[PDB]
């Protein structure tokens, strides 16, 4: 048994004698395939790698916290390899987003002059690029959670890097809880929690007061300019862009609430024909020749439009200026409507300071906040973690889908409100989702990224050929009402909104408004369809958010093989489905 501590972890678990020499050949082939480890000398993490290495070496859990762009994501797996990890088990490295897992794997592989799927591989939904020589496995946190069922000790891995951990999604908190549970039985496993410098002490306390290595390099103070306050919303961006294009060379990063807003803004900025200015929209659906032009050199000024993926996870090069509208989609349960919603809300101070911080890698960066200093100082210091703003039915459903056990025994970094547990269990039973074990219906519910009660209605519409109408309604119920009624009029707003009133149920006013919002962004220009939404007292951003949510929901529904009517269904099978 002393000889097999140099065997691979799954093999070593198996045995503990000449079928050992065989297994030991696997290790020694993998050691032969290990590349030469190199680092770009200009990154703070590369310069500070020796302290990081020693911390990982001497501690089971390390928290690495630092400004975006420090080199955490691309260099930390290399440090683990230099320390000798990744031979007898994999270095697992989670990302919140599927796109980031693949992009990071390709980037590290290229920096090491290797082929992705070799020493650096990745696993996301529909793509498992991992060979027998893979040492570092990039993946989404959802992928790693789904592996727990078939491998409860995670014996595939000798090292797990939880990246972007400050996002505090449910997936991240499930992993941090499961890993803490797992550590007494995996004394050979090493954990690295990787984060922006946002309250890393909370991660430290969770892991038995683990050391925090703060790896930020030099940052320069950023000038903040406050510019308070549809085109009133869009024109503020125009004014900020004009202001900043007077400053010294340097690209502008504009934070946006969603991809349809990015597209409208990119269309508008392009017809403005800014001299020697390139507009670059960052969408999730970008081509493989669009990936790197983000990172390609460029001649004039570049205006990058992005969602908050560019807040801390992605570093756009060459950024000197930021325009911050100060808002973001965030998942939040509404106690008024008893629905898990996606309101557009003012971001926390921590998030606003991360957006500002993207100008501070060079001197004299400028951040324009489209709101008042008064507003900023009123905002919370931190963003609520998702676990504290999600209905417990959704939480329990996902824990049951992953086999994480009872929500009351789980060692959360921050526990949800125990008073809501029984109503969450009750709801899932009434929805036919559980018995805890998932039902086949429950598994389909877990795969729909909307409130479970709304998801149940989508599944029921599949029996009646009106999933299209189910998705219009459910997406409409996942936002704040797009129909503004300013008591500054109260007069034309409701009389223009009653054009879509329906006979039986109020939910089909959403269907009529949806069809009306179609036929109009086809007739009208994108700037005069926009104009139509103040003319019609519609909140421009919510309508765009309504369309974004529907589009994403329809893609998921179709990917699951759920049928979607090509032709609008009629009123009877729409309501037997809701009723």
* Site residues (vs ligand ADP, CB under 6 A): 43, 66, 68-75, 103, 107, 295, 315, 317
Task: Tell whether residue 257 is among the known ligand binding residues.
Answer: no
Residue 144 or 459: the one with the smaller Cβ distance to a copy of itself is 459
Nearest CA among 410, 414, 413, 411 for reference residue 396: 410
Task: Tell whether residue 300 is among the known ligand binding residues.
Answer: no
Residue pair 340/450 in contact by the 8 Å Cβ criterion: yes
Task: Tell whether residue 519 is among the known ligand binding residues.
Answer: no
**End-to-end Cα spacing for the chain:** 64
Nearest CA among 39, 122, 19, 114 for reference residue 80: 39
Residue located via tokens 């039985």: 185
Among 8, 12, 45, 73, binds Mg ion (CB under 5 A): 73
Among 3, 418, 463, 572, binds a copy of itself (CB under 8 A): 463
Task: Tell whether residue 71 is among the known ligand binding residues.
Answer: yes
Tokens of 509: 């006013």
Residue 110 or 481: the one with the smaller Cβ distance to ligand ADP is 110
Among 459, 472, 476, 509, binds a copy of itself (CB under 8 A): 459
The site for Mg ion, by CB under 5 A, has a size of 2
Q: List all residues 6 or more positions away from 326 whose beta carbon is below 8 Å from its beta carbon.
A: 346, 347, 352, 369, 370, 371, 375, 376
The site for a copy of itself, by CB under 8 A, has a size of 42
Beta carbon of residue 353, minimum distance to Mg ion (angstroms, whole number): 17
- 486 phi/psi in degrees, rounded to 5: -65, 125
**How many residues are there in the chain?**
579
Beta bridge partners of 483: 538
Task: Tell whether residue 73 is among the known ligand binding residues.
Answer: yes
Residue 93 or 332: the one with the smaller Cβ distance to ligand ADP is 93
462 part of the interface to a copy of itself, by CB under 8 A: yes
313 CB-contact burial (10 Å; exposed 0-12 / middle 13-18 / buried 19+) = buried
Task: Tell whether residue 74 is among the known ligand binding residues.
Answer: no
Judged by beta carbon distances under 5 to 8 A according to partner kind, the member of ligand ADP, Mg ion, a copy of itself, none in contact with residue 474 is none
Query: What is the per-residue binding string for a copy of itself in 35-54, x denoting contact by CB under 8 A?
Result: x-------------------
Q: What is the rounded CA–CA span in Å between residue 307 and residue 533?
A: 23
Nearest CA among 218, 201, 219, 221 for reference residue 210: 201
Judged by beta carbon distances under 5 to 8 A according to partner kind, the member of ligand ADP, Mg ion, a copy of itself, none in contact with residue 118 is a copy of itself
562 part of the interface to a copy of itself, by CB under 8 A: yes
522 part of the interface to a copy of itself, by CB under 8 A: no
Q: Give, as one character, the DSSP assignment of residue 453.
A: H
Nearest CA among 302, 335, 336 for reference residue 319: 302
Judged by beta carbon distances under 5 to 8 A according to partner kind, the member of a copy of itself, Mg ion, ligand ADP, none in contact with residue 113 is a copy of itself
Judged by beta carbon distances under 5 to 8 A according to partner kind, the member of ligand ADP, Mg ion, a copy of itself, none in contact with residue 343 is none
Nearest CA among 501, 512, 514, 519 for reference residue 550: 514
Residue 272 or 284: the one with the smaller Cβ distance to Mg ion is 284
Q: What is the rounded CA–CA span in Å between residue 409 and residue 406?
A: 6
SS3 category, 420: helix
Nearest CA among 76, 94, 78, 96 for reference residue 160: 94
Task: Tell whether residue 338 is among the known ligand binding residues.
Answer: no
Choices 21-29, 66-74, 355-363, 431-439 (CB under 5 A): range interacting with Mg ion: 66-74
187 part of the interface to a copy of itself, by CB under 8 A: no
**Which sign does the torsion angle of CA 326, 45, 131, 93 carry?**
negative
**Which element (helix H / strand E) includes 180?**
helix 170-182
Tokens of 507: 């939910």
Residue located via tokens 């990744």: 86
Judged by beta carbon distances under 5 to 8 A according to partner kind, the member of a copy of itself, Mg ion, ligand ADP, none in contact with residue 115 is a copy of itself
Residue 326 or 442: the one with the smaller Cβ distance to a copy of itself is 442
SS3 category, 63: strand
Site for a copy of itself in 108-147 (CB under 8 A): 113-115, 117-119, 121, 126-129, 131-134
Residue 75 or 547: the one with the smaller Cβ distance to ligand ADP is 75
Site for a copy of itself in 14-33 (CB under 8 A): 18, 22-23, 25-26, 29, 32-33
**Which sign does the torsion angle of CA 381, 449, 149, 420 carry?**
positive
Count of alpha carbons within 13 angstroms of residue 379, beta-carbon side: 21
Choices 45-53, 271-279, 364-372, 459-467 (CB under 8 A): range interacting with a copy of itself: 459-467
Q: Give, as one character, the DSSP assignment of residue 226.
A: E
Choices 72-80, 337-345, 351-359, 433-441 (CB under 5 A): range interacting with Mg ion: 72-80
- 367 phi/psi in degrees, rounded to 5: -120, 120
Residue 294 or 454: the one with the smaller Cβ distance to ligand ADP is 294
Beta carbon of residue 134, minimum distance to a copy of itself (angstroms, whole number): 6
Residue pair 53/79 in contact by the 8 Å Cβ criterion: yes
114 part of the interface to Mg ion, by CB under 5 A: no
Residue 281 or 442: the one with the smaller Cβ distance to a copy of itself is 442
Among 199, 441, 485, 573, binds a copy of itself (CB under 8 A): 441
Among 201, 423, 430, 559, binds a copy of itself (CB under 8 A): 559
Task: Tell whether residue 72 is among the known ligand binding residues.
Answer: yes
Residue 72 or 542: the one with the smaller Cβ distance to Mg ion is 72
Residue 73 or 475: the one with the smaller Cβ distance to Mg ion is 73
Choices 70-78, 236-244, 443-451, 524-532 (CB under 5 A): range interacting with Mg ion: 70-78
Q: What is the rounded CA–CA span in Å between residue 94 and residue 164?
A: 9
SS3 category, 369: strand
Residue 43 or 339: the one with the smaller Cβ distance to ligand ADP is 43
Neighbour order of strands in the sheet with 277-281: 223-226, 366-369, 319-324, 251-255, 301-306, 277-281
Residues interacting with Mg ion, by CB under 5 A?
A: 72-73
- Binding positions: 66-73
Residues interacting with a copy of itself, by CB under 8 A?
A: 18, 22-23, 25-26, 29, 32-33, 35, 113-115, 117-119, 121, 126-129, 131-134, 435, 439-441, 443-444, 459, 462-463, 555, 558-564, 566
- Binding positions for ATP: 66-73
């Amino acid at each position: 048994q002393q000889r097999l501590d140099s065997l691979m972890l799954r093999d070593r678990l198996r045995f503990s004698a000449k079928e050992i020499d065989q297994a030991a050949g696997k290790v020694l082939l993998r050691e032969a395939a290990r590349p030469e480890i190199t680092y770009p000398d200009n990154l703070p993490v590369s310069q500070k790698k020796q302290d990081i290495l020693e911390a990982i070496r001497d501690h089971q859990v390390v928290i690495v916290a630092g400004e975006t762009g420090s080199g955490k994501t691309t260099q930390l797996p290399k440090i683990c390899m230099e320390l000798g990890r990744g031979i007898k088990g994999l270095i697992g490295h989670t990302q919140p987003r599927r796109l980031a897992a693949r992009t990071v794997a390709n980037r590290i592989a290229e920096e090491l002059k290797t082929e992705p799927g070799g020493c650096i591989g990745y696993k996301v939904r529909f793509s498992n690029h991992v060979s027998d020589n893979t040492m570092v496995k990039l993946m989404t946190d959802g992928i790693l959670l789904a592996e727990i069922q078939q491998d409860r000790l995670l014996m595939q891995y000798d090292t797990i890097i939880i990246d972007e951990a400050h996002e505090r999604s449910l997936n991240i908190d499930f992993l941090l809880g499961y890993l803490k549970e797992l550590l007494p039985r995996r004394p050979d496993l090493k954990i690295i929690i990787t984060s922006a410098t946002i309250d890393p002490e909370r991660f430290s306390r969770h892991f038995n007061n683990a050391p925090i290595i703060e790896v930020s390099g030099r940052t320069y103070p950023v000038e903040v300019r406050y510019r308070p306050i549809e085109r009133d919303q869009l024109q503020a961006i125009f004014d900020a862009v004009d202001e900043l294009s007077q400053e010294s060379p340097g690209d502008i990063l504009i934070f946006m609430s969603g991809e349809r807003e990015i597209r409208d803004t990119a269309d508008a900025l392009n017809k403005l024909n800014l001299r020697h200015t390139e507009i670059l929209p960052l969408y999730a659906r970008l081509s493989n020749s669009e990936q790197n032009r983000v990172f390609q050199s460029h001649s004039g000024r570049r205006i990058v439009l992005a969602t908050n993926v560019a807040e801390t996870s992605l570093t756009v090069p060459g950024i000197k200026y930021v325009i911050d509208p100060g808002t973001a989609r965030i998942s939040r349960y509404s106690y008024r409507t008893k629905v898990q919603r996606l309101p557009i809300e003012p971001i926390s101070q921590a998030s606003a300071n991360q957006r500002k911080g993207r100008c501070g890698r060079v001197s004299e960066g400028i951040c324009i906040r489209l709101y008042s200093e008064d507003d900023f100082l009123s905002r919370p210091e931190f963003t609520d973690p998702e676990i504290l703003r999600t209905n417990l039915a959704s939480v329990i459903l996902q824990m049951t889908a992953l086999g994480l056990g009872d929500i009351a025994a789980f060692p959360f970094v921050e526990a949800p409100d125990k008073r809501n547990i029984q109503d969450g269990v009750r709801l899932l039973e009434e929805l036919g989702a559980i018995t805890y074990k998932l039902t086949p219906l429950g598994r389909q519910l877990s795969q729909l990224p909307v409130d479970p009660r709304l998801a149940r209605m989508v599944l029921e519409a599949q029996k009646h050929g009106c999933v299209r109408e189910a998705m219009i309604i459910t997406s409409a119920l996942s936002i704040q009402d797009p129909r503004e009624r300013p008591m500054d009029k109260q007069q034309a707003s409701d009389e223009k909104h009653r054009r879509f009133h329906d006979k039986e149920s109020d939910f089909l006013a959403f269907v009529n408004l949806w069809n009306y919002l179609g036929e109009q962004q086809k007739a009208l220009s994108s700037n005069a369809f926009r104009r139509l939404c103040r003319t019609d007292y519609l909140n421009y951003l919510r309508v765009r958010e309504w369309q974004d949510i529907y589009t994403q929901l329809r893609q998921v529904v179709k990917e699951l093989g759920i049928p979607v009517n090509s032709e609008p269904a009629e009123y009877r099978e729409i309501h037997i489905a809701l009723l």
